[PDB]
Amino acid sequence: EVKFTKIFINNEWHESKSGKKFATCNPSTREQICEVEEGDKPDVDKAVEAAQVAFQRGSPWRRLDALSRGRLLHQLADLVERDRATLAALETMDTGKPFLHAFFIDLEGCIRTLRYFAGWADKIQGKTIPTDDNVVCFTRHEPIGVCGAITPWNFPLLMLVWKLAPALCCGNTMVLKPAEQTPLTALYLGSLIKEAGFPPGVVNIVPGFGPTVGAAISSHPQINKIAFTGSTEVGKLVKEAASRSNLKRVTLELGGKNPCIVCADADLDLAVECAHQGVFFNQGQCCTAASRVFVEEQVYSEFVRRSVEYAKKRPVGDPFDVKTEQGPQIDQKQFDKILELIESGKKEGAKLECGGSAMEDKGLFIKPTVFSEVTDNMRIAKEEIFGPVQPILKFKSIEEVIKRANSTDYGLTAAVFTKNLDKALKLASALESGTVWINCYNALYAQAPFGGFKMSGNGRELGEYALAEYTEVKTVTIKLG
Amino acid sequence: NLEVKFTKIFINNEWHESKSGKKFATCNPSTREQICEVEEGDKPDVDKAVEAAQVAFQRGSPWRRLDALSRGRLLHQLADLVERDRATLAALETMDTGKPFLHAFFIDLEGCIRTLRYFAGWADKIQGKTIPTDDNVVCFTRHEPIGVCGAITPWNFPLLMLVWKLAPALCCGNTMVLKPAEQTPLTALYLGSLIKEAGFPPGVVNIVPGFGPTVGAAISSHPQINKIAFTGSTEVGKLVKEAASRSNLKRVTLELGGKNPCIVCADADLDLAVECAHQGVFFNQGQCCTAASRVFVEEQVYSEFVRRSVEYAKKRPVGDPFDVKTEQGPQIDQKQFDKILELIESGKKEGAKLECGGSAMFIKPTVFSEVTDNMRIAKEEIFGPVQPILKFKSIEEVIKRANSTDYGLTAAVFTKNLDKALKLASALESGTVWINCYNALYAQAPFGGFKMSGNGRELGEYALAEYTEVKTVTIKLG
Numbered sequence: 001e002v003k004f005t006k007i008f009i010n011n012e013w014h015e016s017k018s019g020k021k022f023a024t025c026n027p028s029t030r031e032q033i034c035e036v037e038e039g040d041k042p043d044v045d046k047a048v049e050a051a052q053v054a055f056q057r058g059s060p061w062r063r064l065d066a067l068s069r070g071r072l073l074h075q076l077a078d079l080v081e082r083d084r085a086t087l088a089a090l091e092t093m094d095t096g097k098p099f100l101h102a103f104f105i106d107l108e109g110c111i112r113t114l115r116y117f118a119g120w121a122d123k124i125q126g127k128t129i130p131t132d133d134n135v136v137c138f139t140r141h142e143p144i145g146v147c148g149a150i151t152p153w154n155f156p157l158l159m160l161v162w163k164l165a166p167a168l169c170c171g172n173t174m175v176l177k178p179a180e181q182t183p184l185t186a187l188y189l190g191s192l193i194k195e196a197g198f199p200p201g202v203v204n205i206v207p208g209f210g211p212t213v214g215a216a217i218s219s220h221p222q223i224n225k226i227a228f229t230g231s232t233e234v235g236k237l238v239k240e241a242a243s244r245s246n247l248k249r250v251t252l253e254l255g256g257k258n259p260c261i262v263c264a265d266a267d268l269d270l271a272v273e274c275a276h277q278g279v280f281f282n283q284g285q286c287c288t289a290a291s292r293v294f295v296e297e298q299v300y301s302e303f304v305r306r307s308v309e310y311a312k313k314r315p316v317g318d319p320f321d322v323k324t325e326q327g328p329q330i331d332q333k334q335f336d337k338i339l340e341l342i343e344s345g346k347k348e349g350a351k352l353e354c355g356g357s358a359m360e361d362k363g364l365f366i367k368p369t370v371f372s373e374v375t376d377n378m379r380i381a382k383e384e385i386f387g388p389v390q391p392i393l394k395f396k397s398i399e400e401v402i403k404r405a406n407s408t409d410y411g412l413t414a415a416v417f418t419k420n421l422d423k424a425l426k427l428a429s430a431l432e433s434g435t436v437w438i439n440c441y442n443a444l445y446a447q448a449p450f451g452g453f454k455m456s457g458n459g460r461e462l463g464e465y466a467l468a469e470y471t472e473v474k475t476v477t478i479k480l481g
Numbered sequence: 482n483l484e485v486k487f488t489k490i491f492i493n494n495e496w497h498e499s500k501s502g503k504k505f506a507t508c509n510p511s512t513r514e515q516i517c518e519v520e521e522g523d524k525p526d527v528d529k530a531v532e533a534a535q536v537a538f539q540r541g542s543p544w545r546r547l548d549a550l551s552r553g554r555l556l557h558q559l560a561d562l563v564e565r566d567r568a569t570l571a572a573l574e575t576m577d578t579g580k581p582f583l584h585a586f587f588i589d590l591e592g593c594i595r596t597l598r599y600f601a602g603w604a605d606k607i608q609g610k611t612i613p614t615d616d617n618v619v620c621f622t623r624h625e626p627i628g629v630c631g632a633i634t635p636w637n638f639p640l641l642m643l644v645w646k647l648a649p650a651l652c653c654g655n656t657m658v659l660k661p662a663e664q665t666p667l668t669a670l671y672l673g674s675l676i677k678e679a680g681f682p683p684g685v686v687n688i689v690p691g692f693g694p695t696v697g698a699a700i701s702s703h704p705q706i707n708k709i710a711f712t713g714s715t716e717v718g719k720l721v722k723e724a725a726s727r728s729n730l731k732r733v734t735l736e737l738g739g740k741n742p743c744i745v746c747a748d749a750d751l752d753l754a755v756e757c758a759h760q761g762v763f764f765n766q767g768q769c770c771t772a773a774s775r776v777f778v779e780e781q782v783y784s785e786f787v788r789r790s791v792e793y794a795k796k797r798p799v800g801d802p803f804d805v806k807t808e809q810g811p812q813i814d815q816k817q818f819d820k821i822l823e824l825i826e827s828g829k830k831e832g833a834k835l836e837c838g839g840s841a842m843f844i845k846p847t848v849f850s851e852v853t854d855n856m857r858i859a860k861e862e863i864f865g866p867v868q869p870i871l872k873f874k875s876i877e878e879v880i881k882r883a884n885s886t887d888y889g890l891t892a893a894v895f896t897k898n899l900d901k902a903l904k905l906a907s908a909l910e911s912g913t914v915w916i917n918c919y920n921a922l923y924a925q926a927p928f929g930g931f932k933m934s935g936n937g938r939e940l941g942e943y944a945l946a947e948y949t950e951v952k953t954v955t956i957k958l959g
């Protein structure tokens with residue numbers, strides 16, 4: 001049963017000001033879970049004012065010493081650990097991802113990120129700066145203020161926690177809008193946040209839609225900082241709204257056309273295993289997903305053959321079943337877009353190696369699909385599919401594949417598979433990607449920054465670098481008489 | 482009697498006429514005469530310069546091949562040249578802006594040299610991290626150059642505001658397209674000659690003069706510019722950042738205006754607080770991003786601060802920028818002059834007390850007492866010689882009133898009391914907080930705005946975060 005469905009302001013639950021509610025549905029059963037309060041600008045304003053009050057100098061939250069902000073973040077992680085089974089179940093109901101993946105990947109990431117950043121609270125350190133004989137000059141990394149977080153539906157809790165953890169450890173307060181498709185875990189986190197003993201108004205949560213709640217957050221004159229995870233087009237709008245309002249600081253985590261490069265000297269079975277996971281994890285609906293699998297011609301045919309085997313053997317079905325590795329797509333909209341891209345694949349001349357249609361009708365499941373013979377100007381090679389489709393391209397030289405890998409407007413991640421030291425490091429430095437994996441895929445750490453080059457994002461999440469998004473530099477310069 | 486040698490577009494260390502053939506005049510604001518004509522760039526010329534900057538940034542280019550310490554040697558070479566032609570640069574700055582020659586020589590150009598030398602020493606000290614993860618994993622970060630950087634700068638400190646951008650951008654290994662303000666293009670163009678003489682490879686720095694809505698807009702929306710740095714008005718800063726986001730999501734640094742407060746406590750050195758508040762308000766005819774717009778004085782020293790301020794204001798010399806004695810030259814443009822006098826009149830009509838000045842001779846140094854928060858002279862950036870003096874009672878009170886602005890560039894506090902100094906420094910929402918001084922800038926100290934006064938920071942180690950892109954390399958060992 002879903003207990004938390006309301007708007008969370010000042011550690012209180014609230015009906016929307018309009019009284020309106022919206023439904024969240026289970027993609028696997030195709031049935032409606034519950035209804036959630038549908039917020040709007042009046043609700044954002046009530047949340048922002050709360051966050052402002054909790055942020056005023058002299059408030060309890062601003063009076064906490066640094067280590068007690070740490071201790072609270074550990075207390076949050078501890079409760080998320082206690083109710084892990086329940087949070088992973090709610091994520092599965094909302095997203096369709098396999099329960100065991102939500103438990104061991106999503107929730108594990110949530111706990112690790114919170115503990116990591118908990119330990120940053122009392123180590124956020126500015127500088128003392130040598131100037132003149134009679135001057136004392138130093139800098140302070142102060143909290144930036146009221147922070148908005150807007151997150152997508154593919155990793156609903158994790159993308160929020162990547163925001164909540166650095167922001168709170170730096171002493172900010174927050175307004176959160178989860179995706180309208182996936183509100184359930186955010187709202188649950190809220191009960192845990194009040195249980196952890198965060199003062200009222202430090203974290204507020206307003207569900208609802210993008211053009212209503214989201215745009216009101218990005219345009220709010222008393223929000224100082226916004227962090228957004230989602231599509232490139234909405235991120236442009238969000239940064240535009242931020243600039244037309246009060247010039248709030250913006251972190252953008254956007255899409256990518258992520259390349260995956262398999263050299264002739266790769267461990268081929270490792271490359272196949274990693275490229276398969278990198279394409280198909282979370283039903284393909286992952287910002288890190290491999291959209292272009294470049295395979296050098298010496299192992300092209302054997303890579304394809306081994307990839308078709310993995311794809312034909314990947315279990316698809318009920319996400320609450322131990323055996324499932326692939327649940328359903330998120331909703332009818334995405335389901336249709338993926339099938340249209342598959343058809344363009346066939347129509348544009350790519351060789352269909354397996355799958356390529358719905359799995360059994362009635363459900364939002366798509367057969368895992370592999371295309372070979374894919375070229376750069378094909379649609380399946382140029383567009384984010386957000387579905388279980390592995391397009392495999394061929395290349396000849398390192399220099400050639402660097403150019404084809406970089407000739408995109410995106411740059412979130414890349415992966416290289418080679419046994420050669422020079423090749424690995426030549427590619428790591430030349431690929432214009434925020435993360436370059438070498439002989440691995442989807443290797444994320446709370447302590448390693450993540451984010452995009454070019455139109456894949458602004459700023460970083462995770463690692464010490466996340467702290468720079470959540471703090472404002474102040475120079476204090478004292479002249480001694 | 483100085484001749485202007487450089488009037489053309491600078492691309493690939495070559496001088497170019499504009500694609501259109503159009504030119505624009507730049508005028509001495511003190512003689513009111515026309516100095517020369519400058520090539521007027523537009524979108525075609527920007528495209529040409531962005532292509533030069535990309536060819537220069539391509540992997541394997543001479544610029545990308547230089548070792549880190551050679552980038553520093555080149556910046557030091559550019560400082561030696563600027564230092565050599567210091568008098569010539571300051572002269573051009575005086576002709577273009579009207580500020581006194583000695584001010585250009587010992588403030589602007591001095592800051593240009595210091596900033597260049599400072600960031601020269603950063604070039605081989607830009608360091609990423611090695612990050613502990615798992616027993617079988619090698620995770621590190623590279624602080625890579627962003628790529629092609631646009632710089633858009635205003636008329637009040639032309640060269641200095643360019644150099645605050647060029648110095649960290651080159652030292653991190655980017656390439657650049659520079660647009661100086663249309664009113665003040667002369668020292669940018671001359672710096673281009675020294676960039677070539679210093680030996681920067683062609684295309685590393687390109688300069689296109691011209692206007693905001695033509696050249697500046699072509700820069701901020703250009704699909705192959707990776708980064709933009711802007712100094713100017715809040716309103717144009719908002720447009721630049723929006724154009725940047727609408728095109729290709731290029732990274733954007735903004736240094737904008739502010740409603741900068743001074744705060745004078747009862748236990749201040751009053752003569753120090755008077756001298757500094759006077760300099761802050763009246764320096765450069767008030768046309769400085771750091772200018773003081775609100776002077777808060779505790780009631781115990783309020784009337785005496787006003788008296789000494791009035792005397793201090795009545796002695797500052799105003800006149801010809803080429804004369805040794807002048808501390809205040811002319812203003813740049815007609816529009817400010819008129820609105821200053823309108824604000825002066827709103828001050829009278831809203832109940833402020835005019836203590837001195839309040840009319841043209843450009844404008845008499847003016848002091849208002851009995852100013853309150855809701856008055857216009859306390860709420861609007863004046864950017865002219867007007868000293869509004871407000872009264873306060875408690876530290877907590879003046880914190881609220883100083884912070885109830887949408888801005889936050891600088892602030893200055895005057896007090897002999899350790900606790901007061903430090904409580905105010907922590908509590909003020911300002912990117913710089915001066916205690917017992919004013920206009921104390923350092924190439925090693927970051928500078929930049931809280932709130933609507935800016936995004937990002939210039940100067941100091943923090944400047945380097947604006948000109949690098951963080952890459953994570955994660956290697957799993959078998």
Ligand SMILES: NC(=O)c1ccc[n+]([C@@H]2O[C@H](COP(=O)([O-])OP(=O)(O)OC[C@H]3O[C@@H](n4cnc5c(N)ncnc54)[C@H](O)[C@@H]3O)[C@@H](O)[C@H]2O)c1
Pocket residue numbers: 150151152153154177178179180208209210211213214215218229230231232233234235237238
């Ligand atoms: N522009 C839209 O709202 C819209 C409409 C139809 C389809 N889509 C597509 O459907 C997919 C949705 O997946 P996603 O969640 O990763 O992408 P997304 O970028 O649409 O959504 C991410 C988050 O941003 C919010 N958001 C949406 N519009 C916003 C706005 N105008 N201002 C502020 N916040 C806003 C959403 O509510 C959600 O919380 C994407 O492919 C997207 O392009 C988007």
